[PDB]
Design a binder for this molecule. Structure first.
Ligand SMILES: Nc1ncnc2n[nH]cc12
Ligand SMILES: [Cl-]
Length: 260
């Protein structure tokens, strides 16, 4: 079994493009963490990770270089991902969706407030701790959009097509924050309907045209109660300057609705 200084690498938690994530257990102390193994722009990622200090963001513990392999030591989320709590075609109980949405907003407000954009919010990147607390994970596409109190526009296209905002397909440069707000709306849809609304938010996508023409008698919208659906009408707005901001999400009727 492989090992790094005092830690054993006991099991795989993620095996993707950007290396593997392992469960690491300190042989002496029994402390369990997560370790990302990169087989060597990760200087950027580490710099962003060291900024992160919030209950709804995965904490960074530190790193070790050993030849051409870096080890990123991060808070373990033993509960798996939001992806695993979504029943296909069903979603999850509205009160659980609302609580996860509250936590996702707390995390995103935090990141925006230190001028960080995640750029790939989706259920695989939203991990759960042992008490089902949501943690925003995977900062490999994250970037700075505000420095010295000056906003910079993004122009790199990235993320995951079903989750990306339409401006990212249509504009040369765009604001970072409304792109993360949009992806949070697609996550809320997935939680309440167990179904993604469209392959991509382009005029060539029939399901996306249906939404802009307000055909909410179709799936996934006909599975969603009128209150959360009124919030999705304010989030999934094609013009990013008319899209609801997080301050205004926090004033929404469903957002503030007491639930089971
Ligand atoms: N993929 C992952 N699984 C569990 N905990 C983690 N923390 N950072 C990434 C993780
Ligand atoms: Cl889904």
């Amino acid at each position: 079994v492989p090992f790094v200084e005092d830690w054993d690498l006991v099991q795989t938690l993620g095996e993707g493009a950007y290396g593997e994530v392992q469960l690491a257990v300190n042989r002496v102390t029994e402390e369990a963490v997560a370790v990302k193994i990169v087989d060597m722009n990760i200087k950027k990622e580490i710099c962003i990770l060291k900024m992160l200090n919030h209950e709804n963001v995965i904490k960074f513990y530190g790193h070790r270089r050993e030849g051409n392999i870096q080890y990123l030591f991060m808070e373990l989320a033993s509960g798996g991902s939001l992806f695993d709590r979504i029943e296909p075609d069903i979603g999850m109980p509205e009160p659980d969706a609302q609580r996860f949405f509250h936590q996702l907003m707390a995390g995103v407000v935090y990141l925006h407030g230190i001028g960080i954009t995640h750029r790939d919010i989706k259920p695989h990147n939203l991990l759960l701790d042992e008490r089902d607390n949501l943690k925003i994970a995977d900062y490999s596409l994250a970037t700075v959009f505000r420095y010295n109190n000056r906003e910079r526009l993004l122009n790199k296209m990235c993320g995951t097509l079903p989750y990306v905002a339409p401006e990212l397909l249509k504009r040369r440069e765009f604001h970072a924050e409304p792109v993360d707000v949009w992806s949070c709306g697609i996550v809320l849809t997935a939680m309440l309907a167990g179904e993604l609304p469209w392959d991509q938010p382009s005029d060539s996508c029939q399901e996306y045209s249906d939404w802009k023409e307000k055909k909410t008698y179709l799936n996934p919208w006909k599975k969603i109660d009128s209150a959360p659906l009124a919030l999705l009408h304010k989030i999934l707005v094609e013009n990013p300057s008319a899209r609801i901001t997080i301050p205004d999400i926090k004033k929404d009727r469903w957002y503030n609705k007491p639930l089971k």
